[PDB]
Fold this protein.
Amino acid sequence: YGALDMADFEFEQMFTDALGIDEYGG
Amino acid sequence: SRAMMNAFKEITTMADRINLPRNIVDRTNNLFKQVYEQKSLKGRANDAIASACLYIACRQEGVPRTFKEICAVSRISKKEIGRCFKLILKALETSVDLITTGDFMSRFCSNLCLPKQVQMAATHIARKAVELDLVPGRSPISVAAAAIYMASQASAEKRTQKEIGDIAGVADVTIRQSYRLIYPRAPDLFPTDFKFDTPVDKLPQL
């Protein structure tokens, strides 16, 4: 089950800035 | 081996520009040495894997308060960066998450030339998070220490996790655990007194 954990940090690397600019998309 | 030498050079180039200590390069070299010899990871994204190991290296000693200050390379294949990160993150832990009980003082945590302004701010951040129980993965004490780091960040204070992990004697990884699902979309941990020194707004990744 441990090896299943990979994309959990993906959102903390890509989505962090991707979503971070969502509320600042102006 | 092809991306091995490539990634190393990329990391060294960035680390040298940011003026990072050997603690980064030496660690990244050791980490990449193992992640490059993975069955699943055959070197899909050199830049991503390089940044992944780099982030883990500066996780404790090297991070300039925020990962944003060193997000020079972390702007490409960010998906794969976090992907490989979790793989190595669970491979080696400092095992400092065994105390988290002496942070009740908090004053000693600011012994590293840290103004009490950060102290008062941190307690307010922690209170909002603890009273809301945003992060029930540890204890209310862990949120306090983590809040001190957050307060320093928003006050333009470049501190590392090492101080809270070793000097404070709380729990290094506890900061990461608290600073996990504590934010729904933005650092909504400010009650009212927090005027926010650093007006960056978009502050993701520490």
